Amino acid sequence: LSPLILRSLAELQDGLNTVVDKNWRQLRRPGDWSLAITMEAAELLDSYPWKWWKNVKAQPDLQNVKIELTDILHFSLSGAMQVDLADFMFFPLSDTNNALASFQNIIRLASLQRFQLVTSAVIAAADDIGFNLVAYYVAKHTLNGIRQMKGYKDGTYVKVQKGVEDNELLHGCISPFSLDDVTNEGNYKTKWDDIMHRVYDAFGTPKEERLNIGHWL
């Protein structure tokens, strides 16, 4: 990913973290981000049929893998703001052995606070798998804000409260967007705005509580 796009992602990330807490930088510490990456990596690992004692014919939940890698990126962008890849990542990740090893290595890197390296690993993973990480990031960033608006912090929102996990709606919201659309330096901000409005529409956010791309960048 280009330096411009990475910067814009990090700026979105700062903004989201601020919605969660003003003064997040004084409230948080690098070990919080390591723990967060660890827990998402566990969710990612749990998308594979790694259990030899349970549901042994299960297939990998490749749709969920996309969400979990996107969540890791939120937290590694965060950790980096408060602070070789071939030694850790093994391709192709469609091979379950490669995934389990590569994604357990994300936990070791998170524990060492190697956040920029985690970010590169996520980007490398999305490129190998062949999904649009940028588009997923913007979609899930928008959902993270909607969660905070609906009282996630206070316990008045839970992610499966309309009977379907909120994350699952994100695939449809990003379906029209190519890699080039969301990374083209002269037009990306409009595509990021389109993604935001598709997610707001998916969750019926009132027009008045919506934020445009210009609010974040």
Pick out the residues of the known binding site for Mg(2+): 40, 43, 68, 71
Instruction: Using the minimum distance from each CB to Na ion, give the nearer residue, 8 or 144.
Output: 144
- C-alpha distances in angstroms, 191 versus 79, 129, 138, 173? 26, 22, 10, 12
Binding residues: 13, 17, 40, 43, 51-53, 68, 71, 144, 147, 152, 159
In this structure, what token pair is assigned to residue 46? Answer: 């749990």
**Residues near ligand DUN, by CB under 6 A:** 16-17, 20, 43, 53-54, 71, 74-75, 78, 140, 144, 159, 167
* Residue that is written with structure tokens 């003064």 in the block: 23
What is the contact mask toward Na ion in residues 33 to 72, using x (rule: CB under 5 A)? ----------x-----------------------------
User: What does the alpha-carbon distance between residue 183 and residue 181 come to, in Å, rounded to a whole number?
Assistant: 6
Question: First vs last Cα of the chain: how many Å apart?
Answer: 18
Instruction: Using the minimum distance from each CB to Na ion, give the nearer residue, 43 or 128.
Output: 43
Residue 140 interacts, among Na ion, a second copy, ligand DUN, none and using kind-specific CB cut-offs from 5 to 8 Å, with ligand DUN
- C-alpha distances in angstroms, 146 versus 9, 129, 133, 192? 18, 28, 20, 16
